[PDB]
Write a protein that binds this ligand. Structure first.
Ligand SMILES: *[C@@H]1O[C@H](CO)[C@@H](O[C@@H]2O[C@H](CO)[C@@H](O[C@@H]3O[C@H](CO[C@H]4O[C@H](CO)[C@@H](O)[C@H](O[C@H]5O[C@H](CO)[C@@H](O)[C@H](O)[C@@H]5O)[C@@H]4O)[C@@H](O)[C@H](O[C@H]4O[C@H](CO)[C@@H](O)[C@H](O)[C@@H]4O[C@H]4O[C@H](CO)[C@@H](O)[C@H](O)[C@@H]4O)[C@@H]3O)[C@H](O)[C@H]2NC(C)=O)[C@H](O)[C@H]1NC(C)=O
Ligand SMILES: *[C@@H]1O[C@H](CO)[C@@H](O[C@@H]2O[C@H](CO)[C@@H](O[C@@H]3O[C@H](CO[C@H]4O[C@H](CO)[C@@H](O)[C@H](O)[C@@H]4O)[C@@H](O)[C@H](O[C@H]4O[C@H](CO)[C@@H](O)[C@H](O)[C@@H]4O)[C@@H]3O)[C@H](O)[C@H]2NC(C)=O)[C@H](O)[C@H]1NC(C)=O
Ligand SMILES: *[C@@H]1O[C@H](CO)[C@@H](O[C@@H]2O[C@H](CO)[C@@H](O)[C@H](O)[C@H]2NC(C)=O)[C@H](O)[C@H]1NC(C)=O
Ligand SMILES: *[C@@H]1O[C@H](CO)[C@@H](O)[C@H](O)[C@H]1NC(C)=O
Ligand SMILES: *[C@@H]1O[C@H](CO)[C@@H](O)[C@H](O)[C@H]1NC(C)=O
Ligand SMILES: *[C@@H]1O[C@H](CO)[C@@H](O)[C@H](O)[C@H]1NC(C)=O
Ligand SMILES: *[C@@H]1O[C@H](CO)[C@@H](O)[C@H](O)[C@H]1NC(C)=O
Ligand SMILES: *[C@@H]1O[C@H](CO)[C@@H](O)[C@H](O)[C@H]1NC(C)=O
Ligand SMILES: *[C@@H]1O[C@H](CO)[C@@H](O)[C@H](O)[C@H]1NC(C)=O
Lengths: 341, 230, 213
């Protein structure tokens, strides 16, 4: 009745018309309202093959968030390959809202409902929907924030675990709150995040046990990022329109897997000059706004990179990636694929 | 016009380091990773590392070079860089940079493809302790041990010069038929050396003068060696 | 990891024949991670085939690739004169390291031709400087495989010689090899017989070119 196909999608959102928040402003003209009667039909005895890493829905969402960021966060100075653009840079309200991705006529979206589905291969419990769930376009590195959780066990996602040049997406089944704050007042860009070290090390031990199931019970070792921009060597994210940069060596402490029960406090910094995650160059913004800048986020996933050359070695090394924001949408679009009727 | 321009050739002492730049032009620099590959004399290409220029600028290096090689990228100036430290004699090669989709984007008509399609012009890195030295030309004289049925072989030994290259001609260019100028081999002394030979009729050994003309532009040395039967 | 093997070392065909080059993958990679390259001296490597069987724009249609995942083949339908070069396969994505294969040299077919072997004693001008170089010339031979053995008073020399081969001549499709045996003036004056033993497909018996100091 159907076959796999690629086509242009459209977005739907619950963006209010009079909101000044910039995800709303963009979605009011780039998306339609949400269907109040979502219809999901379960396919009896149907097996479909999914591939979250070769999914065109991710390319289309990436092109949306790029468009959404060009309209919203225009920097004072843009530096993109020998073109200096000086511009106005007004502070904005920036809180991501969920974006639904819907399919046009003649096509439909197949959703995978296997609780243990890792992202590739067959899916036993498939249903048919017209739109995806509400996916917030949260742009971050190292830690996936504010996403969905796995329904049963922790899920390790990768196009090929044997290929060390492929990103690993860890999908947690228990959220760990991260509470970041720029205190109100010597250094206006000094900030910090707070994580329950008891809840985090308990989850971090579980992801190492899950990685051991994929690497012949070898010793799992974590190490900090080996190089690159500060956007990838640090937990990078944006809060209240301010670009944060947090050091996460305390978050991947191998010895904690015992003074580990306390509160982990990551030293952060707000930077005006950033490397755009679009990969297009440098961008300078205005100094941070006054007052307490605070964001409380759910840690729902970890982006990892594995060091190769562990053939005869009895251990595996893992480092936090990675500056490919298309992996962020894959962490939510993995169970979806578009087919033509 | 898609193009990549590298910095010029360099000569470095053993133990020193070298940094090579790679400037992109004619395409969108953020859209492609950049690899570094070298080719040494008489050896296949060796992949040194790649730079994820569009995904944070991180780099992955070859295991045999980790700790010695370093790569990075600047997007605003569309330049990739490579630095190799503790240079040894084995590091003498032509170093190349190349762009690659590396499966990051589904480019139209090609998919999530992998392939270094555009390469820089190459940078010659010569690791040696020697300084600019002119060649000493020695004769390869023809004789009974150099004759075989009407034809005779003679030549010149262009030994102990640095650096490359030397150009060798015979009789000011009037003699080309039968000439074989061999590629120079970097001796253990750090100085290059090659031979240029030519086959001529044995009857002409007593009537025709054979002079090899050696020019070494780096040292500004020009030698004309008359080769006589021994 | 992945270990790449290419066979044969030298593939010898006439201009116009079909060429088939083998590239073996030890552990076997994804078909999207096997590329082919052409290399001519003085030029950067040229991407001919990406993803096992695809051609980038500007690559002639006679170049064709195929592979199962662990065994790969590059096909040249009709060999043009500019196609005689070295061809490497590469692990383009399934690394790292993104290893290149050892390479296969495609040279021009020819009837077997034995080398003209010449030996050159060291000059007196060089002998006065303290070094002695004995040159042995293998002239105009085919195929490329040639074995040169230096013997000083019937003693097999090993690590004191260097070989240099010219590119295949475009007219007669032959090769030329030079072998230089370097010795100090002291060691040279101690020994009498200096020989050059050549082994080639065109010679029924190994030819020895020798002289006495
Ligand atoms: C978030 O995800 C994590 C994973 O990343 C979850 O933690 C996992 O939870 C699963 C269960 O949902 C555990 O899997 C089970 O493991 C059983 C054996 O484990 C024992 O050995 C391992 C080491 O080899 C120890 O680590 C375990 O001990 C620890 O955990 C247990 C509880 O899990 C504690 O009690 C201990 O104190 C330790 O803390 C154990 O000693 C394994 O038997 C079981 O498999 C059976 O059941 C499953 C379904 O659950 C069946 O599919 C399967 O076929 C098996 O059924 C067989 O046996 C039953 C009877 O036993 C028969 O009826 C059947 O016919 C059949 O013969 C399962 O694999 C996993 O170990 C655990 N991992 C970690 C690191 O904690 C979190 O719970 C999850 N959190 C949330 C909130 O969702
Ligand atoms: C992961 O997801 C969580 C939950 O979605 C996010 O948490 C949200 O964080 C944002 C800030 O980034 C919070 O937004 C803040 O709301 C405050 C409350 O405003 C409401 O209520 C007041 C009265 O109490 C009304 O007057 C007002 O109209 C609203 O109804 C605002 O006061 C904050 O704005 C302040 O600062 C901004 C600029 O920084 C100024 O423009 C404002 O004038 C004001 O001074 C702010 O908008 C939001 O409340 C949080 N959600 C929840 C449910 O608590 C995480 O941020 C998110 N993580 C990431 C990384 O995206
Ligand atoms: C995700 O799960 C699928 C199975 O649901 C795994 O696919 C298997 O892959 C191996 C090769 O590694 C094949 O031999 C099996 O036949 C596949 N199982 C099937 C098709 O049911 C896949 O490897 C898993 N990937 C990860 C990253 O865990
Ligand atoms: C199948 O998927 C549906 C929708 O997510 C879910 O409600 C149901 O429990 C699943 N059933 C099985 C047997 O997996
Ligand atoms: C955080 O995760 C919990 C479940 O652990 C969920 O109930 C809550 O809605 C999540 N909050 C956000 C902002 O996503
Ligand atoms: C976050 O931390 C601040 C103090 O740094 C605290 O006042 C606030 O209540 C915390 N919020 C949560 C949700 O824990
Ligand atoms: C992160 O902090 C640790 C100490 O907590 C420090 O050693 C490391 O250099 C820091 N990393 C960066 C990128 O600053
Ligand atoms: C790791 O934790 C131990 C205590 O469990 C602490 O002493 C050490 O400083 C921590 N190291 C880092 C890098 O956070
Ligand atoms: C994963 O990569 C390894 C080599 O890098 C390869 O042997 C294997 O076939 C790959 N697996 C898949 C499913 O592509």
């Amino acid at each position: 009745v159907w076959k796999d196909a690629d086509t242009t999608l459209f977005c739907a959102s619950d963006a209010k018309a009079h909101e000044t928040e910039c995800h709303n402003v963009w979605a009011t003209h780039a998306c339609v309202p949400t269907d109040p009667n979502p219809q999901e039909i379960h396919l009896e005895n149907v097996t479909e093959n999914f591939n979250m890493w070769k999914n065109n829905m991710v390319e289309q969402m990436q092109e949306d968030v790029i468009s959404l960021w060009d309209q919203c966060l225009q920097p004072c100075v843009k530096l993109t390959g020998g073109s200096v653009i000086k511009q106005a840079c007004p502070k904005i309200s920036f809180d991501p809202i969920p974006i639904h991705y819907c399919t046009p006529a003649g096509y439909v979206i197949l959703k995978c409902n296997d609780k243990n589905f890792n992202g590739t291969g067959p899916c036993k419990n498939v249903s048919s929907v017209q739109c995806t769930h509400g996916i917030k376009p949260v742009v971050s590195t190292q830690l996936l924030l504010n996403g969905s959780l796995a329904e049963e066990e922790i899920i390790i996602r990768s196009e090929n675990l044997t290929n060390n040049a492929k990103t690993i997406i860890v999908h947690l089944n228990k959220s760990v709150e991260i509470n970041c704050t720029r205190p109100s007042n010597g250094d206006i860009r000094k900030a910090y995040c707070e994580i329950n070290g008891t809840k985090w090390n308990k989850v971090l031990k579980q992801v190492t046990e899950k990685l051991k199931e994929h690497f012949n019970n070898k010793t799992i070792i974590f190490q900090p990022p080996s190089g690159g921009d500060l956007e990838i060597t640090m937990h990078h994210f944006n809060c209240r329109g301010e670009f944060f940069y947090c050091n996460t060596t305390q978050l991947f402490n191998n010895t904690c897997i015992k003074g580990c029960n306390g509160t982990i406090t990551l030293p952060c910094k707000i930077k005006q000059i950033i490397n755009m995650w679009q990969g297009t160059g440098q961008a300078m913004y205005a100094p941070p706004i006054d007052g307490k800048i605070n964001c409380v986020s759910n840690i729902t996933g970890i982006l990892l990179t594995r060091d190769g050359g562990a053939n005869n070695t009895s251990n595996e090394t893992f480092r936090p990636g990675g500056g490919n924001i298309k992996d962020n949408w894959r962490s939510e679009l993995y169970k979806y694929k578009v087919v033509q009727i | 016009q898609v193009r990549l321009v590298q910095s010029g050739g360099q000569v470095r002492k053993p133990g020193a380091s070298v940094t090579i730049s790679c400037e992109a032009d004619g395409y969108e620099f953020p859209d492609y990773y950049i690899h570094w590959v070298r080719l040494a004399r008489g050896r296949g290409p060796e992949w040194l590392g790649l730079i994820k220029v569009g995904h944070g600028g991180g780099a992955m290096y070859a295991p045999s070079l980790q700790g010695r090689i370093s790569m990075s990228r600047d997007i605003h100036t569309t330049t990739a860089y490579m630095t190799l430290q503790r240079l040894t004699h084995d590091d003498t090669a032509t170093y190349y940079c190349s762009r690659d989709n590396f499966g990051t984007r589904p480019v139209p008509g090609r998919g999530y493809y992998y392939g270094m399609d555009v390469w820089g012009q190459g940078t010659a890195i010569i690791v040696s302790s020697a300084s600019t030295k002119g060649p000493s030309v020695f004769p390869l004289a023809p004789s009974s041990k150099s004759t075989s049925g009407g034809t005779a072989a003679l030549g010149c030994l262009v030994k102990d010069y640095f650096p490359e290259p030397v150009t060798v001609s015979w009789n000011s260019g009037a003699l080309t038929s039968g000439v074989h100028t061999f590629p120079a081999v970097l001796q253990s002394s750090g100085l290059y050396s090659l031979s240029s030979v030519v086959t001529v009729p044995s009857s002409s050994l007593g009537t025709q003068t054979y002079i090899c003309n050696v020019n070494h532009k780096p040292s500004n040395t020009k030698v004309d060696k008359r080769v006589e039967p021994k | 990891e992945i270990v790449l093997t290419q066979s044969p070392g030298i593939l010898s065909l006439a201009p116009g024949e079909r060429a088939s080059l083998s590239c073996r993958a030890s552990y076997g990679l994804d078909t999207s991670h096997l590329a082919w390259f052409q290399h001519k001296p003085g030029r950067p490597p040229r991407l001919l085939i990406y993803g096992t069987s695809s051609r980038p724009p500007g690559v002639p249609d006679r170049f064709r690739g195929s592979g199962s995942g662990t065994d790969f083949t590059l096909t040249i339908t009709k060999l043009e004169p500019e196609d005689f070069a070295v061809y490497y396969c590469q692990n383009s994505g399934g690394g790292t390291p993104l290893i290149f294969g050892p390479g296969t040299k495609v040279d021009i077919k020819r009837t077997v031709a034995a080398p003209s072997v010449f030996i050159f004693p060291p000059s007196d001008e060089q002998l006065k400087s303290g070094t002695a170089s004995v040159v042995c010339l293998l002239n105009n031979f085919y195929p490329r495989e040639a074995k040169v053995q230096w013997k000083v008073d019937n003693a097999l020399q090993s690590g004191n010689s260097q070989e240099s081969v010219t590119e295949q001549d475009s007219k007669d499709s032959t090769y030329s090899l030079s072998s230089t045996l370097t010795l100090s003036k002291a060691d040279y004056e101690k020994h009498k017989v200096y020989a050059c033993e050549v082994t080639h497909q065109g010679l029924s018996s190994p030819v020895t070119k020798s002289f006495n100091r």
